[PDB]
Amino acid sequence: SMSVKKPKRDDSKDLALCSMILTEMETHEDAWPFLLPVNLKLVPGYKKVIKKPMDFSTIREKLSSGQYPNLETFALDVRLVFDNCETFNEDDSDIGRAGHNMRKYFEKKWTDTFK
Ligand SMILES: CC(=O)c1cccc(O)c1
Numbered sequence: 092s093m094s095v096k097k098p099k100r101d102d103s104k105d106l107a108l109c110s111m112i113l114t115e116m117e118t119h120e121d122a123w124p125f126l127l128p129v130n131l132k133l134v135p136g137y138k139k140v141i142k143k144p145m146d147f148s149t150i151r152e153k154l155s156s157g158q159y160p161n162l163e164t165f166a167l168d169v170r171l172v173f174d175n176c177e178t179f180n181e182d183d184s185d186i187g188r189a190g191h192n193m194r195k196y197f198e199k200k201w202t203d204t205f206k
């Protein structure tokens with residue numbers, strides 16, 4: 092509360108660490124459904140069903156331009172990619188399996204890096 096400070100977690104390397112994690116996700120062989128925004132004009136259902144589209148290239152643009160106030164907002168966008176994927180794809184489709192794999196990959200990197 093006012094003039095009562097909780098001890099300061101060092102956040103100075105967060106930007107660099109999120110960038111490295113994102114690089115590792117960008118180069119994973121199962122990243123291909125997530126590299127670019129889903130084409131809303133070529134993919135039936137997507138625009139109406141998925142209220143907040145997100146993809147790796149959009150996360151990268153946002154990270155590169157100061158649009159994440161903190162490491163948790165970055166993680167929320169990453170998770171949104173995989174949450175959207177589950178909403179729109181069957182668990183046992185190539186894209187559906189790619190999403191589950193990439194989520195598992197991300198969360199281990201997240202835990203190992205920050206937690
Ligand atoms: C990421 C996703 O859910 C997707 C990507 C390309 C085509 C498609 O039908 C769905």
Ligand SMILES: [Cl-]
Binds near residue numbers: 179184
């Ligand atoms: Cl499917």
